[PDB]
């Protein structure tokens, strides 16, 4: 039985939530300490008193989430570069330089982006790095345009998808008065 | 012959350019003085030395045009309210309060917006108000959503139009250090 529970978790992928959940906990050195949340929250608290679930979740849905996703759906390297860890960004820039080879660039535009709720507050084993995992759905229309002022690149019929994102947040007590991002960063971001 | 040239000008509408051209010159008190451009430019010049066709046209395509159109394609009253004269805005807010009655609001998103070129620099008769008429095409996808977190309102199939805009600009030497808009305003804006 729990022999198949493992099957699914390994056979998930579809649910970006559980995909990140994995991506950190399995890829290199992932282990969760069963903090019980409170240690993860009180930890952010120490980092910055003004912190509260409310406080952050709004910042999430009101400015961060909507800000990075738009940055995603288009070739907005400069935006992601301010929120992405060396890990998740570089993997991005990986498909960017490959999408470039095809003389195509990505414009898309997102609409609605509902969801955005923090559902998990656990810390990674390697260094007890307090992490927050947020998930949201975003009705966006994805498109791609070509090299020389070229129409809408490959296909005219770009369906308006309704994707599900899952991302892992973390803050740094060091460099909090950065203003743009101010501590927050993104450890491997995953689209649905 | 020129009996039909009048027919077309009156029978235009399609070409927003010539529609504004009319909208000002005919609706209430419209007459152009054949300034010969230079008087209109030197006039802006006086208003603000830093002024140059180059200078402005960029500001047009780089920040103003793209900024007001996005404000258009969605219910972004606060944006238009900073650029629209009492005339063009109020007419907007006219269809806004009517679109509201139908429990629908407008979200759309614009893409590419090419064109943006100043093709005419003439001044209105009533007060020799120096006006600039800009025109641009904008591949946008128009949509509308409903009253209660309701899908995509009326129709699922929202075609991605490619409209043509024509607008009439004017500046005020008084209130130039406004920063947001800084002098520039919009006299009756017209969509294609």
UniProtKB/Swiss-Prot annotation, chains A, B:
Family: Belongs to the Tim44 family.
Residues of the full protein shown: 234 to 425 of 431
Function in brief: Essential component of the PAM complex, a complex required for the translocation of transit peptide-containing proteins from the inner membrane into the mitochondrial matrix in an ATP-dependent manner. Recruits mitochondrial HSP70 and its co-chaperone (MGE1) to drive protein translocation into the matrix using ATP as an energy source.
Native source species: Saccharomyces cerevisiae (strain ATCC 204508 / S288c)
Superkingdom per UniProt: Eukaryota
Subunit structure: Component of the PAM complex, at least composed of SSC1 (mtHsp70), MGE1, TIM44, PAM16/TIM16, PAM17 and PAM18/TIM14. Forms part of the receptor complex that consists of at least 3 different proteins (TIM17, TIM23, TIM44).
Name under which the protein is recorded: Mitochondrial import inner membrane translocase subunit TIM44
Compartment(s) of residence: Mitochondrion inner membrane
